[PDB]
Design a protein around this ligand. Structure first.
Ligand SMILES: Nc1ccn([C@@H]2O[C@H](COP(=O)(O)O)[C@@H](O)[C@H]2O)c(=O)n1
Length: 223
């Protein structure tokens, strides 16, 4: 077959970015943070004064999106039109806009080739919502990482508190349920586990346990 792919799909703040990175490093494979692409698209829209409420306006922006990634240094660098926007795209505001633009079918379609371009040997670890169901349906290894909304909001609260940012549980939880609801209820490419995906309920599993479980499954399936 062509290059193998390990997909990691799941709700917001489920630890997909962390797990994807750890696996790609352990296996020495390529990585794809798909969510980062929707976030950069949303950011580009604000900069270029594109109406996020209009699918017609967003299609051109998506079709000609100039986004690139750089890593293998300890963290992922997201580049928009030649500028590092790694930090700028990690906010609730951008996340919200990314989820809104992601609901448009024509926009998602315009981004398919770009994502699928990431499949290269020796392999690709793809993190997102519809990686195992729409972007890479023939993936030999599909993982669906999940955890309760309450736990996922709690983990985010602690991450922001470490950095000294103002937050309160009620908002973070509401924000998370709001975004996940949209992603799971949209008519096209909704967040849903692939029939053949291994579901990892990590509410009470540590980071290292998840990594160990995900790697065992992939190695058995791939070899
Ligand atoms: N494969 C993907 C990755 C992200 N997304 C969208 O992008 C938003 C932001 O994703 P991340 O939180 O994973 O960065 C999600 O809420 C979702 O609406 C998607 O629809 N399909």
């Amino acid at each position: 077959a062509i290059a193998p792919v390990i997909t990691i799909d799941g709700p917001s703040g489920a630890g997909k970015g962390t797990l994807c990175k750890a696996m790609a490093e352990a296996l020495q494979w390529h990585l794809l943070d798909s969510g980062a692409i929707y976030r950069v698209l949303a950011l580009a829209a604000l900069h270029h004064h594109v109406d996020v409420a209009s699918e017609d306006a967003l299609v051109p922006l998506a079709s000609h999106l100039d986004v690139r990634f750089v890593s293998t240094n300890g963290n992922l660098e997201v580049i928009l039109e030649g500028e590092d926007v790694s930090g700028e795209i990690r906010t609730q505001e951008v996340a919200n806009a990314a989820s809104q633009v992601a609901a448009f079918p024509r926009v998602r379609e315009a981004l398919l080739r770009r994502q699928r371009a990431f499949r290269e040997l020796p392999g690709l670890i793809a993190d997102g919502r519809d990686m195992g169901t729409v972007v890479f349906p023939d993936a030999p290894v599909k993982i669906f990482l999940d955890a309760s909304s309450e736990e996922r909001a709690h983990r985010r609260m602690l991450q922001l508190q470490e950095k000294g940012f103002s937050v309160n549980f009620e908002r973070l939880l509401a924000e998370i349920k709001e975004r996940d609801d949209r992603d799971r209820n949209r008519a096209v490419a909704p967040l849903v586990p692939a029939a053949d995906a291994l579901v990892l309920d990590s509410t009470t599993l540590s980071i290292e346990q998840v990594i160990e479980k995900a790697l065992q499954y992939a190695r058995q399936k791939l070899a």
